[PDB]
RNA sequence: GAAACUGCGAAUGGCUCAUUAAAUCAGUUAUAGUUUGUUUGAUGGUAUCUACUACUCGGAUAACCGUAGUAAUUCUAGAGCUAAUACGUGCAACAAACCCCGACUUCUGGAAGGGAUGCAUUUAUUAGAUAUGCGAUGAUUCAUGAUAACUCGACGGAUCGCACGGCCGCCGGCGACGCAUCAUUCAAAUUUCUGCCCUAUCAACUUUCGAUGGUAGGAUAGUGGCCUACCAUGGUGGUGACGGGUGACGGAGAAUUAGGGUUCGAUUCCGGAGAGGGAGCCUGAGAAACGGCUA
């Protein structure tokens, strides 16, 4: 059958595909959290480790986990499950959808793989070269993890470092940098005490008017005390 | 004396093993009696106030509040526990020959064991909460004829 | 699902109704939670009309019990279910069901009356002196006292687990005490 | 139905806000607020079909949304927002000020008012009761709570509320001998002074209301509203000082002011 | 500012009259027998207590990108990032008062210290009077207060836009959105009385397996044989029950008009029911929803 092997670290993929039972047999009868030597599949993958993760079968049915069978099952799935993607669809609807076990088989057409174990040998097309992420942390906290900055370091200066820089279609020069949240200002600090300070209203607010209540009440009571004694 | 279920019976709220005596307090106060009126200018019978019987669909001593129509019947039935079939007699107009035609309607009525009652007495009931499938309302008064 | 709903039943004159709509949702019923003794307490979540919430217990093992005659509360362990009038199998099953006569330990209530009373069922001046003010009108439900020898208290379940989800009640005491234990006493 | 109903037909819209029958399919839905949907005079109303500043719905929307109208003080951008009796309507731009009366036909009037008069308005007093902690607290029939009232106010009485400080500064008990006017039924925009009231056990309370020209309708005490302290009222009434005039009469008056 | 997450709505509207004969429905009642997103008016005081971010906590995921499967679907699996008014946590500005225990003590006392103490839930005790204080109803052990405890509480703001100021970093305005309680509004549910065409070639019907009522429970938002256990034999009927027919949805109304009457009412307004026939159900304040799902 055919496999998607992807490499994490270099945030690499591959398609690979394979046509001899012998080389397929390692792979069958495992299931999707198992773990697989690569010496059977070819002799470069020498030392490697792969890591199932799923696949899908020859009609398109993806594989789901926990359903110890080899062959095709209907399930009651959940929207934003495996299996289920939902798109379009109302909050709390369930949709009744074929899926295959857990179980590797002849039945499959593709098997999702993933590198944990770094063999002897690099592939050409996986391990060479590594995608560098697109996008930097957003969240201030984040950016300090990153920068290992203390509590008095200035976070600020450190999104140029990792902002990128461009040229449009038209020729034009630009630069985009991220965001940042969760960022401690003068705002938020103004914010908080604006909060306090309404709090603090309330409670002055309270007190005053129960006071001015009790402060008729009693009034009105010596007037009634003051009739009563005649 | 009126423990006659498998459970024991007694008035919701009135504490009974009180260190002390209820002999100033309230009905309902203290371990003594409760009881209440009604209003709409029906009397509390003295039976309701000094009787010993439990009943938590009793105007005057349950937890049911009288509201809505007050009726007038004749007692139809007293054979069951509690509750009596009140027939109310009254004349359909017939208009196409302007004339009446005589027609009765049987309203289930809960009865306090505070009142005695006969098939053939006048009654009146007062309007309540749903008491049973059918039972809609609770006899205020008793005329014995 | 279960329906509170007349439209099944038979008309006061005993003539058949004919049914001319579904069910509705704000007529259904849910199943009764059978909330039983054990060590590991179980409460479920449910959500009900309005988005208010109840609680389901299917296992509980204390409840807030209260002494009335001292005004005393607290959170003991339901040792045994011993009557219930409504049905005699929900004994056998150990069913957690209001006004449910129910064993409960005595070790709090011990515990309150030696520290209140000075009595079992260093101190400072002070504290003898208040000891002695109480004692004056301690009186005590010899049948209670019977009750305390043995570590166990009956008392009434006075909450509904399956809509709060606790077994909460009162110790039995005077005429009602006296009425459930000659019931028990076969 | 499976829920709240968010249209409100032409012809089942209340007649007295006159609305045509083959104007459309649809009337303006009130929304919720401080009165009942049909005991209310939304702002779309006001401003479109009695004043005629607006011409549409969506003109009604633009002005609506610029800030320009207030009820009670209070800017209101909600175009079937439910102004009722008593409610006061301010358009600082135009400097004018409208208080809502009911006129002797029954109908809705937006009577023009001062300055001083736009700052007060009166409330009817459902009930007192205690609230949380115990907590006196009292609620009008427009929505309004009102936290450690005055011991002397009960149900029925009338409270004057200062809108700017939002403050009762005086009360009127309901009692005979004071100028009311009708809310409901069909002497609705009457005014007169009570005779007498006739109350029975578990039911509804009658009041006698003499006009000032003699005549006497009776109603019930819930469509009574208290205007003052004995006969003289304590805002400013409507033209017509809510006298209700027979059709006869109504006829002579026309055709001598035709002639 | 596309896209996407988040929130809200889609329970309104429109269509139809199949079922349904005290049933729907009309007038007239009740909820002191309940729920109610939202709008309008008011009300939010104890969390860490010995860890110890509050000048601000933590882990993901969409869009995006790249490996794809299938004949195929807003069918679908891996891999690499990155946000919150998404999710999960957490100091929650600081008090007073009340109650309990309470060393110690000049001891009928007061006293250090400790516990409890926000709002919400549950169960008990207690007050809530009125022929020198104490609210409301025709009517409630009602509103509400106090005490003893209880709950492994989705509560008690880690949110956003404008502006830009006074003291000596501290304070500071106008709003947006959000959580909790009461009241109000928009409503629902159930419910009192009376009222419906033809038919006796329909006279007895209902009660094992709920029929009528009682006791105790379960369930419900709540009352109720709505259901469970026990108990009693009750309940309706020539004043026509029960059964059958309707080419029967009910009403506002339509046709004809001495008066009385006769006939019609599927259809634009009100109320009910249905989405080919049943049944079940998630989401949600609100559905037994069908331009939602399950058999
Ligand atoms: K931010
Ligand atoms: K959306
Ligand atoms: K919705
Ligand atoms: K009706
Ligand atoms: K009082
Ligand atoms: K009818
Ligand atoms: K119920
Ligand atoms: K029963
Ligand atoms: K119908
Ligand atoms: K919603
Ligand atoms: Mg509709
Ligand atoms: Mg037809
Ligand atoms: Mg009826
Ligand atoms: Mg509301
Ligand atoms: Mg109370
Ligand atoms: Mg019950
Ligand atoms: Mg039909
Ligand atoms: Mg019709
Ligand atoms: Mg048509
Ligand atoms: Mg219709
Ligand atoms: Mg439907
Ligand atoms: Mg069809
Ligand atoms: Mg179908
Ligand atoms: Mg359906
Ligand atoms: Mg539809």
């Known amino acids: ?73 209907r399930l009651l799935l959940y929207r934003g499950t495996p299996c289920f993607r939902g798109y379009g669809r109302r909050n709390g609807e369930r949709r009744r959808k074929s899926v295959r076990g857990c179980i590797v088989s002849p039945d499959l057409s593709v098997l999702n793989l993933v590198i944990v174990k770094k063999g002897e040998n ?59 949240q969760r960022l401690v200002t003068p705002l938020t600090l103004q914010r908080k005490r604006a909060r306090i300070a309404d709090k603090k209203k309330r409670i002055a607010k309270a007190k005053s008017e129960a006071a001015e209540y009790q402060k008729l009440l009693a009034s009105r009571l010596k007037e009634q005390r003051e009739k009563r004694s005649e | 004396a009126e423990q006659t279920e498998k459970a024991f019976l007694k008035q919701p ?36 106030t000094e009787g010993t019987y439990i009943d938590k669909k009793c105007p005057f001593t349950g937890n049911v509040s009288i509201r809505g129509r007050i009726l007038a019947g004749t007692c139809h039935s007293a054979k069951m526990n509690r509750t009596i079939i009140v027939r109310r007699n009254y004349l359909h107009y017939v208009k196409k020959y302007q004339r009446y035609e005589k027609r009765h309607s049987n309203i289930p009525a809960h009865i306090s064991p505070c009142f005695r009652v006969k098939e053939g007495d006048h009654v009146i009931i007062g309007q309540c909460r749903p008491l049973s499938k059918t039972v809609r309302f609770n006899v205020l008064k008793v005329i014995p004829a | 699902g279960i329906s509170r709903d007349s439209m099944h039943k038979r008309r006061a004159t005993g003539g058949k109704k004919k049914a001319w709509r579904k069910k509705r949702k704000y007529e259904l019923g849910r199943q009764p939670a059978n909330t039983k003794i054990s060590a590991n307490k179980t409460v479920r979540r449910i959500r009900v009309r309005g988005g208010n919430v109840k609680w389901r217990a299917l296992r509980l093992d204390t409840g807030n019990y209260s002494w009335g005659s001292e005004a005393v509360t607290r959170k003991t362990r339901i040792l045994d279910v011993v009557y219930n009038a409504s049905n005699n199998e929900l004994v056998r099953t150990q069913t957690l069901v209001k006004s449910a006569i129910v064993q409960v330990d005595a070790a709090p209530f011990k515990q309150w009356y030696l520290q209140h009373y000075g009595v079992d069922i260093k101190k400072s001046n002070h504290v003898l002196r208040k000891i002695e003010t109480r004692q004056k009108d301690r009186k005590l439900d010899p049948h209670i006292e019977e009750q305390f020898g043995g570590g166990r208290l009956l008392a009434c379940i006075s909450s509904r687990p399956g809509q709060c989800g606790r077994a909460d009640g009162y110790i039995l005491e005077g005429k009602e005490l006296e009425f459930y234990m000659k019931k028990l006493q076969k | 139905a499976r829920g709240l109903k968010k249209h409100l037909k032409r012809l089942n819209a209340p007649k007295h806000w006159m609305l045509d029958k083959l104007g459309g399919a649809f009337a303006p839905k009130p929304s919720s607020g401080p009165h009942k949907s049909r005991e209310c005079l939304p702002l779309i109303i006001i401003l479109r079909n009695r004043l005629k500043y607006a011409l549409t719905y969506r003109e009604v929307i633009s002005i609506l949304m610029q800030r ?20 006061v309507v301010s358009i600082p731009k135009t400097n004018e000020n409208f208080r809502l009366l009911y006129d002797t036909k029954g109908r809705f009037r937006l009577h ?123 805002v400013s009434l409507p033209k017509g000082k809510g006298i209700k005039l027979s059709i006869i009469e109504e006829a002579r008056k026309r055709l001598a002011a035709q002639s």
């Open chain 4, 68 to 87: 320009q109208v207030m009820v009670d003080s209070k800017v209101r951008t909600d175009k079937t927002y439910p102004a009722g009796f008593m409610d």
């Open chain 4, 112 to 234: 023009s008012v001062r300055d001083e008069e736009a700052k007060f308005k009166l409330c009817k007093v459902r009930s007192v009761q205690f609230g949380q902690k115990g907590i006196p607290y009292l609620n009008t029939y427009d929505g309004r709570t009102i936290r450690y009232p005055d011991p002397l106010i009960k149900a029925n009485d009338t409270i004057k509320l200062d809108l700017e400080s939002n403050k009762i500064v005086d009360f009127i008990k309901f009692d005979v001998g004071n100028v009311v006017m009708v809310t409901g039924g069909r002497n609705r925009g009457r005014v007169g002074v009570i005779k007498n009231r006739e109350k029975h056990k578990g039911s509804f309370e009658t009041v006698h209301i003499q006009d000032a020209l003699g005549h006497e309708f009776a109603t019930r005490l819930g469509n009574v509203f208290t205007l003052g302290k004995g006969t003289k009222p304590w």
């Open chain 1, 122 to 180: 690099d592939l050409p097309g996986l391990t060479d070269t590594e995608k560098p992420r697109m996008r930097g942390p957003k969240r201030a906290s984040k950016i300090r993890k990153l920068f290992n900055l203390s509590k008095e370091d200035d976070v600020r200066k450190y999104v140029n470092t990792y902002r990128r820089n461009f040229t449009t279609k038209n020729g034009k020069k630009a630069s985009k940098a991220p965001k940042i």
């Open chain 1, 1 to 73: 059958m055919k496999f998607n092997i992807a490499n994490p670290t270099t945030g690499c993929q591959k398609k690979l595909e394979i046509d001899d039972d012998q080389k397929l047999r390692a792979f069958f009868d495992k299931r999707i959290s198992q773990e697989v030597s690569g010496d059977a599949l070819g002799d470069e993958f020498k030392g490697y480790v792969f890591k199932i993760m799923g696949g899908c079968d020859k009609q398109g049915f993806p594989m789901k986990q926990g359903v110890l069978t080899p062959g095709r099952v």
């Open chain 2, 13 to 48: 709220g009135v504490f009974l093993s009180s260190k002390k005596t209820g002999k100033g307090k309230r009905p309902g106060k203290g371990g003594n009696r409760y009881f209440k009126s009604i209003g709409l200018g029906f009397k509390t019978p003295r039976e309701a």
